[PDB]
Amino acid sequence: DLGTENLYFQSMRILVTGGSGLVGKAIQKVVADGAGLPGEDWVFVSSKDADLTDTAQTRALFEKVQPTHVIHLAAMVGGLFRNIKYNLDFWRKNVHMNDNVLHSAFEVGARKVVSCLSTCIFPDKTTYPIDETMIHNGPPHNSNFGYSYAKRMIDVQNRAYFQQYGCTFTAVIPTNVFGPHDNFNIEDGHVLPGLIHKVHLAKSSGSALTVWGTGNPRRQFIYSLDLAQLFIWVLREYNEVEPIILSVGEEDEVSIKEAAEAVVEAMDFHGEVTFDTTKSDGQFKKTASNSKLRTYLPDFRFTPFKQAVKETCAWFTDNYEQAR
Amino acid sequence: DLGTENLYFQSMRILVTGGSGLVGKAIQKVVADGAGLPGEDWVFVSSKDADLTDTAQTRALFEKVQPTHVIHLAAMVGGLFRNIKYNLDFWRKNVHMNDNVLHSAFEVGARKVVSCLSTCIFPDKTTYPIDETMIHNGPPHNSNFGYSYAKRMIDVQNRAYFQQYGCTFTAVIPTNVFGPHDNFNIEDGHVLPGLIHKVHLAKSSGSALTVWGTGNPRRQFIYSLDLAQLFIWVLREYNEVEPIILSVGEEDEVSIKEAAEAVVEAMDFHGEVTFDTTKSDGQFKKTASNSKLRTYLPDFRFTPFKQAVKETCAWFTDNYEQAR
Numbered sequence: 001d002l003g004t005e006n007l008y009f010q011s012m013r014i015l016v017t018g019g020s021g022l023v024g025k026a027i028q029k030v031v032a033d034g035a036g037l038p039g040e041d042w043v044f045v046s047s048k049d050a051d052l053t054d055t056a057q058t059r060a061l062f063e064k065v066q067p068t069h070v071i072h073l074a075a076m077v078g079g080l081f082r083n084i085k086y087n088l089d090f091w092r093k094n095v096h097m098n099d100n101v102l103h104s105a106f107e108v109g110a111r112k113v114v115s116c117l118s119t120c121i122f123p124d125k126t127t128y129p130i131d132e133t134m135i136h137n138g139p140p141h142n143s144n145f146g147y148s149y150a151k152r153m154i155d156v157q158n159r160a161y162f163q164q165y166g167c168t169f170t171a172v173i174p175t176n177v178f179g180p181h182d183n184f185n186i187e188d189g190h191v192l193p194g195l196i197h198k199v200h201l202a203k204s205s206g207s208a209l210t211v212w213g214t215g216n217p218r219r220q221f222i223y224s225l226d227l228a229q230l231f232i233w234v235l236r237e238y239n240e241v242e243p244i245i246l247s248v249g250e251e252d253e254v255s256i257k258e259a260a261e262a263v264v265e266a267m268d269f270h271g272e273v274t275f276d277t278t279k280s281d282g283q284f285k286k287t288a289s290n291s292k293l294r295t296y297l298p299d300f301r302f303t304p305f306k307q308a309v310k311e312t313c314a315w316f317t318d319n320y321e322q323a324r
Numbered sequence: 325d326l327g328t329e330n331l332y333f334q335s336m337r338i339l340v341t342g343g344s345g346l347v348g349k350a351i352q353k354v355v356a357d358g359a360g361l362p363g364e365d366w367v368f369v370s371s372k373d374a375d376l377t378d379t380a381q382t383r384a385l386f387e388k389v390q391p392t393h394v395i396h397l398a399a400m401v402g403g404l405f406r407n408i409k410y411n412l413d414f415w416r417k418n419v420h421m422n423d424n425v426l427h428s429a430f431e432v433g434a435r436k437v438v439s440c441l442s443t444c445i446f447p448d449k450t451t452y453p454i455d456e457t458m459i460h461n462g463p464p465h466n467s468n469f470g471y472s473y474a475k476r477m478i479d480v481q482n483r484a485y486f487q488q489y490g491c492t493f494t495a496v497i498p499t500n501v502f503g504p505h506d507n508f509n510i511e512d513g514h515v516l517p518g519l520i521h522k523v524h525l526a527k528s529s530g531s532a533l534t535v536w537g538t539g540n541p542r543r544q545f546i547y548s549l550d551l552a553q554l555f556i557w558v559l560r561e562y563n564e565v566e567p568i569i570l571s572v573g574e575e576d577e578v579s580i581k582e583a584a585e586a587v588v589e590a591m592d593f594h595g596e597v598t599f600d601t602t603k604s605d606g607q608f609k610k611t612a613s614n615s616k617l618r619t620y621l622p623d624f625r626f627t628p629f630k631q632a633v634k635e636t637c638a639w640f641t642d643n644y645e646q647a648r
């Protein structure tokens with residue numbers, strides 16, 4: 001329910017950082033298709049509009065736009081998952097970005113900010129499933145600690161702004177996102193868009209599909225379009241400082257193998273599918289509970305997985321040249 | 325052993341931020357009394373020399389001084405423990421200060437940085453005693469989370485600089501510090517310098533001593549002069565990125581009651597001593613292990629507690645007008 005029974009409307013200016021990305025582009029579509037309400041001006045920006053690692057440029061963007069609300073998606077994110085690690089660069093640039101954005105929002109007097117966290121913030125050693133309370137219950141995985149701790153500190157900023165200044169800054173925690181306008185780069189991208197590109201190359205080359213690792217790791221996937229809907233809802237209706245996980249349930253986890261099968265079917269691929277165990281498996285699970293989301297939106301129906309994959313595969317094929 | 329059997333010496337420029345405080349002033353005395361080695365220039369600064377929350381001012385200080393080594397003591401610390409809490413201010417100003425300092429040190433090519441952490445960084449729910457491994461094993465106490473998390477992130481920066489850039493940035497974790505040049509303010513200061521001031525007022529007023537709470541909480545105290553010696557050693561000899569606790573052992577913990585008795589004796593006070601149970605007790609224990617320190621310096625002898633208190637009491641009495 002992204003409409004309203006209200007007869008009157010407030011003038012809202014909604015700045016969306018990282019608007020040109022996977023998540024941001026999904027919000028644009030959902031809004032452009034009529035999820036936008038009267039009085040709401042949606043302003044989507046990218047790094048062209050301002051480098052958010054720079055305080056002066058961020059301040060200037062916020063002075064120009066004067067947002068009443070902020071959805072904060074921007075992060076320095078590539079190339080995470082590459083061979084050599086750059087934990088200081090990722091820690092320092094992301095903390096600067098997050099501080100610039102939250103504090104400019106504070107300065108302009110924004111009513112609400114919703115930032116985007118990641119399952120990489122959760123503790124390495126933890127019970128399962130993981131919920132929003134457990135975010136700080138032990139250190140994150142060492143592989144990319146810099147990035148993880150920078151995200152965790154968004155929660156700490158939100159809590160501090162609330163406690164001292166009364167601001168309603170909060171955050172959402174998506175699981176693994178996929179959809180149109182993803183980064184489909186095979187070396188640097190996530191597994192699901194990477195698989196879509198890999199299968200596309202297997203048809204164009206007539207080769208076989210080589211999946212990295214065992215195919216055993218389990219993941220919760222969420223369609224960018226489903227996430228966008230939940231994001232707009234959170235912006236309008238969710239008022240806890242504590243973050244909220246946006247994800248399908250623990251029972252709808254699927255293995256990398258099952259995910260590759262969904263792509264193979266969707267792209268109508270008949271070549272061999274092999275699992276290269278020489279490349280390392282990542283974490284086996286990062287299973288998140290959506291209990292909280294279910295208390296707020298019990299009747300919300302996610303797009304079925306195979307359909308969401310087909311649409312994404314269809315988009316990639318139809319926009320191959322312009323895609324990432 | 326703060327001397328050396330070496331015959332040759334390297335030119336070292338050692339910048340000490342927060343040099344005008346309790347810890348900093350102890351380092352000055354220890355150095356001025358001959359702990360300084362040939363080739364070492366010690367440069368002690370305070371906020372007069374540069375406001376370390378300001379990047380430009382910090383960068384300029386570092387350009388002028390060109391430190392090879394940094395002992396980083398500066399923190400925005402007052403008024404912590406006051407009634408109303410300001411978690412955003414403490415989080416944000418301290419993170420800025422720490423980032424400015426560590427990153428300027430990195431920029432000038434400093435060989436080593438040693439920062440100062442606090443027992444407030446440790447998890448609220450933890451086993452005892454606490455060691456340097458447990459620093460991130462659960463959230464800190466909510467009272468002053470902003471300050472605590474800002475300190476914790478020094479460890480994360482150190483680890484990141486090491487991993488990506490090869491820098492030797494590390495930290496020390498003192499327990500409760502006391503000595504000359506402390507802040508003896510009764511509303512805002514720590515318990516031990518607060519008690520010294522309270523007893524001084526009880527003599528000058530002819531009143532009785534009112535200690536807040538039961539006197540049951542147990543604390544590890546460390547004389548600023550002992551800490552200074554260990555700090556110089558750490559700078560010269562300690563090369564782990566992981567921090568190191570500087571403290572007397574678990575067996576030398578003393579209660580607030582025992583601490584007040586040490587002051588009463590030292591200041592030769594004969595009035596009544598009452599324990600106002602109406603005011604709340606803080607945390608019962610924050611017990612830290614010095615096992616690691618003992619592996620490096622087994623024969624290091626701490627100043628006996630009652631002597632350290634007497635000297636501090638003596639200093640306060642002799643410098644009452646000029647003291648804080």
Ligand SMILES: NC(=O)c1ccc[n+]([C@@H]2O[C@H](COP(=O)([O-])OP(=O)(O)OC[C@H]3O[C@@H](n4cnc5c(N)ncnc54)[C@H](OP(=O)(O)O)[C@@H]3O)[C@@H](O)[C@H]2O)c1
Pocket residue numbers: 017018019020021022023024045046047048050051052053072073074075076077097116117118119173174175176177178181182183190
């Ligand atoms: N995709 C996932 O699986 C996933 C899961 C959980 C959370 N998230 C979160 O979702 C958010 C966005 O991810 P995404 O999946 O949409 O990534 P994406 O498609 O790579 O988009 C990233 C966005 O960040 C912007 N950006 C990066 N550096 C910037 C800078 N210095 N200044 C200004 N803007 C900058 C980019 O602008 P340009 O394109 O102009 O550089 C881009 O619009 C991130 O906060 C991420 O942590 C993603």
Ligand SMILES: NC(=O)c1ccc[n+]([C@@H]2O[C@H](COP(=O)([O-])OP(=O)(O)OC[C@H]3O[C@@H](n4cnc5c(N)ncnc54)[C@H](OP(=O)(O)O)[C@@H]3O)[C@@H](O)[C@H]2O)c1
Pocket residue numbers: 341342343344345346347348369370371372374375376377396397398399400401421440441442443497498499500501502505506507514
């Ligand atoms: N005392 C303890 O019990 C204890 C225990 C554990 C850890 N520590 C750590 O020890 C370090 C020093 O503690 P302390 O007890 O010596 O504190 P202190 O006596 O209050 O001194 C703090 C020092 O920091 C400087 N400072 C504060 N804000 C500054 C700014 N914006 N720019 C530049 N300098 C600034 C002060 O200079 P000005 O006076 O010129 O402002 C002062 O020299 C801190 O990191 C603290 O967390 C202390």
